[PDB]
Amino acid sequence: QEVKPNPLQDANLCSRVFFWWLNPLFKIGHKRRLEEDDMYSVLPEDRSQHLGEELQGFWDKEVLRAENDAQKPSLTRAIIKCYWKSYLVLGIFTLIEESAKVIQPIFLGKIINYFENYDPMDSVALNTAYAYATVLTFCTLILAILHHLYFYHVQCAGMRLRVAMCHMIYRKALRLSNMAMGKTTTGQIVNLLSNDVNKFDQVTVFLHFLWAGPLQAIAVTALLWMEIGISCLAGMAVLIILLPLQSCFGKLFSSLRSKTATFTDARIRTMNEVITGIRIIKMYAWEKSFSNLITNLRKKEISKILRSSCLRGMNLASFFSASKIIVFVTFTTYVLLGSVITASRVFVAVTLYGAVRLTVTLFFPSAIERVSEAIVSIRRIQTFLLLDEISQRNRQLPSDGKKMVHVQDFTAFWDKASETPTLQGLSFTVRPGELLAVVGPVGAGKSSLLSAVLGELAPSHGLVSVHGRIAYVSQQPWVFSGTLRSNILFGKKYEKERYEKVIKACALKKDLQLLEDGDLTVIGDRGTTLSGGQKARVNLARAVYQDADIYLLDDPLSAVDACVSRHLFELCICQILHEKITILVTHQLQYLKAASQILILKDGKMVQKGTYTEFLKSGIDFGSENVPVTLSEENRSEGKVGFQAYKNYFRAGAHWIVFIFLILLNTAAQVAYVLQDWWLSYWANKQSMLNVTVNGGGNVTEKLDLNWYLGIYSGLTVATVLFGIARSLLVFYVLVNSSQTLHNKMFESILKAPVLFFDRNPIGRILNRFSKDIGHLDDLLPLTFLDFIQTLLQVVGVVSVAVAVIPWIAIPLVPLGIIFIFLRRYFLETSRDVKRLESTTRSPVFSHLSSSLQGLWTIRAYKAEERCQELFDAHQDLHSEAWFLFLTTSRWFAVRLDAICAMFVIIVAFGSLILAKTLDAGQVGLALSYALTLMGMFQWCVRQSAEVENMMISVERVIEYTDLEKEAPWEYQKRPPPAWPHEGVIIFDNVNFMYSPGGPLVLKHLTALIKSQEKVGIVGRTGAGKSSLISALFRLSEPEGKIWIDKILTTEIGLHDLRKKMSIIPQEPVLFTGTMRKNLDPFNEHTDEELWNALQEVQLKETIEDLPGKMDTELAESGSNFSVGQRQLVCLARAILRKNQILIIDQATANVDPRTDELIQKKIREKFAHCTVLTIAHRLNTIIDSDKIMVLDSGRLKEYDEPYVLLQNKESLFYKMVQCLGKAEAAALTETAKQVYFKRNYPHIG
Ligand SMILES: Nc1ncnc2c1ncn2[C@@H]1O[C@H](COP(=O)(O)OP(=O)(O)OP(=O)(O)O)[C@@H](O)[C@H]1O
Ligand SMILES: Nc1ncnc2c1ncn2[C@@H]1O[C@H](COP(=O)(O)OP(=O)(O)OP(=O)(O)O)[C@@H](O)[C@H]1O
Ligand SMILES: [Mg+2]
Ligand SMILES: [Mg+2]
């Protein structure tokens, strides 16, 4: 699958300058659409691993020199020391080009001097005119040929720098410790890799012009001084009064960029709690809660960028304002001093200014802004690089060949600001062949003991020793993108004789046989495709298949069915891991009979540590075609999209009256700019005629109205300046408003998407369009729209000025125009698909980064950092190839445009003499300079239009999401009564649920009756449909059959109205980043009294009050500070505070100790004893006292009756399941069920 080599490496200079190696690519793109197998590979020196590892050495040398100097490090010094060698050589080309751009007007003015004094006698004049023509061609060739190659090399260097910085940021994020994890979130890294690197490839382009500005300005001032006297110093004064203002604007630009960045960080941080928990938001109708925050943050960000956009508009208006400013300046003095201008002074002035402005007034403020943004970018990258790194594992001592884990007197602190430690007095050891059992209450430190073995917890007192590889199993399963086989292997080689044994031991055979593809089906991100019980066993199978030496199982039997839990514990831990080192932690009091070492931890204090018989003897107790991968690329059909997107983009900004006032002001500014030069030429001609008539017998002396002329010129100039300023401000404001409206519409439409979209499209595919695709509309879109509208206006003005001349020069404008149109049409048909492929290849970078930033724990546990870095480098090169191809195509188009313009100039200069041998200056003279200005404006306008089309097809990616077909509306026309549900009777009648249209069936003929105020329990093997039934009830996807709730069909009411009447406890734990008050209730409607009452009921306030800011503690990403027990308690508190009629418990006692479990069960039974509670759990000790228990097997309901009736039948699946888990527990459960049945049936004798 190796892509063909890039023909650039096998090309000479003659084909590299003109980009001749792009003919087959364009010929292929013109016929069919481009694919990923048609993009050329990057050079061997432009790889990600070759640049990142090269810059890392320089960064390490710089930080070592800073540590030796005992000062603060800096990234700019290392960047310079690394990228100055391959960049100082490019300065000589700019130095010679800026000199040629000043030399060219000299010859342009000298060649016209011959036509001004045309004589048919002397041939030396013709000889020197031809020599001037030859040197003019010599200068224009080097000015218009190598400039695009220099731009291409600069863009390549910028892309290399961006790739190196991205690799460095990724390598830094792959080593962040737990302390640094609480200061930064995923949104920060997303922003740093999306927008903070988009300025490096742009700031390295304009610094040359930045430092060459004054050098060319002084040169052109000294050149003008040769003809103009002391009066020319006013122009230098204007320059030295304008440039310091542009330099001082850098501080304001830096402050505005810093504010934009610190706000965009918080704006992007609120993405995981919106997307990854879309089911939790839909099950609680909290979409408006997140919309009240995200749109407000976007409005604040827009208000902050308003000042930056106003400054950019002011600079872009000053760009074309300073030209006429400098025209008026020194001319107000040369006219008032008595001297006059007829043709020569004004002509040389305009011909010099036309070349000076394009650099000085354009690239200087742009370069200032680019440097101001790059400073903030480098500062943020350095701040991210100076975070607290993870404690690297020290060099282990040479052992005697054996492996063991020894911990003696361990003491560490999770948070240095806290007063109490997490662990106290740890002294134990594990040998190969033993079984350690950790038991304790909630929030005691059971998982901290396992985390300390890995190396994530810095030991504050003591020493640890780890000999051998570790296979860690996190409490929360982590499944990345890919098939189940790739998830089990995880870099290991496929071995059927061991894979089948691992599948049989983990009881995954039924799961692989019930699916449609077995172990070859794809799995979405975050394991949204599979269930919790399936991922909990997939992770264990992956850990077992690795064949490691240390197995740190962090409660893998918490979300697994009780019937298969015994089989798993018997055929995966006591048989496979019997010879290895393992530390199993759990809450069940039946698996500890086979363990030889039990550590009863309590609040991080080692109370007891012995065997299982020592606790019973002493008397102490401890219980008190093949489903392609993730819906590959589907963005196609980019066949010259029409005005359908342009109309929407123009209407989302302002009203039609504002849209027409915009073009009115644009044409007014253009006609004023034209009339300025028109009046200047008229005054010059009038002064020439006056000098002629006063030299040829000037009997009368009638001087022109000096005051009137000066006043009208100043008025025209001021009007033009004000019109330009106003139109720039209006355009920028309209474009900012349009971008904000488009972003708001996209955000409002995304929330209304079905649950299938979120788990069929990867996180990266919908995250890269919320930071880069929508962030470009604030950084590149208006700067490209206004730089093209003004260019088109200037082209129209130049054409209207030139049409007033003999059409002998305007006739050949039609073939040139149609050739340019054909070239633009041929180049866009390729550039569109090239940009599409660039976006499609940049998407997987973020798609993999989002999964890596969540699975870094398992990554460090398995030591797959090399594989992760290789995958990241491959994903980055996949996009760098398309970026290089886009840059090469743009440079080839520019080279072709410049070549055609030079050919047209040569033609109009050569083929005109045969007919103008007699036609002198005034009618043939200065026409060459006219044509040069015309071709320059054309070359600028074509590139501007190409860039605008590129930006339009880029924003088309956002515009496409305007429809985003949805499910049933929020509220239908028929509304339920305000007292509904009054009873809560749910009736099913042949209901079927399918996660995808045409997919495998889950619920097959499910019929059950649920009375009012009847506690119904649901049990059965995992992955059977226990959650599918809840999903069909909550209407996450359109089900079959009919579902009646209090004589009301679910398919005839509003989705939000149905979801707001049923509370639910989520199966997986998830918390929102923010304050505890907002996490408990974001609407801010609950009183503190009832909040504390609910906290006391949940039994969490006792430890909540320990923190100083009980209601102000800001949580980390996904609740990194809180544990699984704390997350479950917060979810229970939220469900209690909901206080609705219908309550559905899915998974509430997964990782809960038996004591607090029974406590909260009794509390719930006392509180909600007057409503219908649909509780679901694996442990029967909390549901054996229910009214009826459902038995879901393979989707179909096998039996549904009373628990005692099920126990009285030795053939029932419920009895066959409860027969396991020992004998005493089963007997106690049967006795409790019999007592409950007696008390319910015969109270007269019970
Ligand atoms: N990043 C963190 N910063 C500060 N404290 C933390 C962090 N992570 C966990 N904790 C603390 O550790 C405690 C939980 O410890 P640990 O994870 O070792 O046991 P556990 O597995 O949660 O116990 P159980 O399984 O009974 O819930 C929590 O009370 C929490 O306050
Ligand atoms: N988006 C999806 N695409 C394909 N299949 C899916 C999707 N969502 C769920 N499934 C399948 O539907 C089944 C539903 O299982 P369910 O979630 O009811 O298990 P569970 O009862 O939650 O397990 P446990 O009781 O251990 O938590 C899963 O086995 C899964 O394979
Ligand atoms: Mg735990
Ligand atoms: Mg479930």
Author numbering: 6 to 629, 680 to 1301
Provide text from the study.
Human multidrug resistance protein 4 (hMRP4, also known as ABCC4), with a representative topology of the MRP subfamily, translocates various substrates across the membrane and contributes to the development of multidrug resistance. Moreover, hMRP4 transports various endogenous signaling molecules, including cyclic nucleotides, folic acid, eicosanoids, urate, prostaglandins, leukotrienes, and conjugated steroids. Unlike bMRP1, which contains an extra transmembrane domain (TMD) denoted as TMD0, hMRP4 presents a typical ABC transporter structure with two TMDs (TMD1 and TMD2) and two nucleotide-binding domains (NBDs; NBD1 and NBD2). Here, we captured four distinct states of hMRP4 along the ATP-driven transport cycle, including the apo inward-open (no substrate or ATP), substrate-bound inward-open (no ATP), inhibitor-bound inward-open (no ATP) and ATP-bound outward-open (no substrate, but ATP-Mg2+) states.
Therefore, to collect sufficient NBD-dimerized hMRP4 particles for 3D EM reconstruction, besides the engineered EQ mutation, we also introduced two cysteine mutations in each NBD (E568C and Q1275C) to stabilize the dimerized NBDs of hMRP4 and added 2 mM ATP-Mg2+ in the whole hMRP4 purification process. However, the EM density corresponding to the disulfide bond was not observed in the ATP-bound hMRP4 map, indicating the dimerized NBDs were mainly stabilized by the binding of ATP molecules, as has been reported for other ATP-bound ABC transporters. We found that a majority of particles adopted a closed NBD conformation based on two-dimensional (2D) class averages. We obtained a well-defined three-dimensional (3D) electron microscopy map with an overall resolution of ~3.5 Å, enabling us to build the atomic model for most regions of hMRP4. The structural comparison revealed that the structure of the ATP-bound hMRP4 presented a conformation resembling that of the outward-open ATP-bound bMRP1 and ABCD1 rather than the outward-occluded human SUR1 and ABCB6 (hSUR1). The hydrated cavity in the ATP-bound hMRP4 structure was exposed to the solvent and open to the outer leaflet, thus indicating that the ATP-bound structure we solved is likely in an outward-open state. The ATP binding induced the patching of TMDs by forming extensive contacts between the two halves of the transporter along the entire vertical axis. As a result, an obvious outward-open cavity was created by the curvature of the TMs, forming a substrate-releasing site. As expected, the NBDs formed a pseudo-symmetric “head-to-tail” dimer through the binding of ATP molecules, which were well-solved in the EM map, displaying clear densities corresponding to ATP and Mg2+.
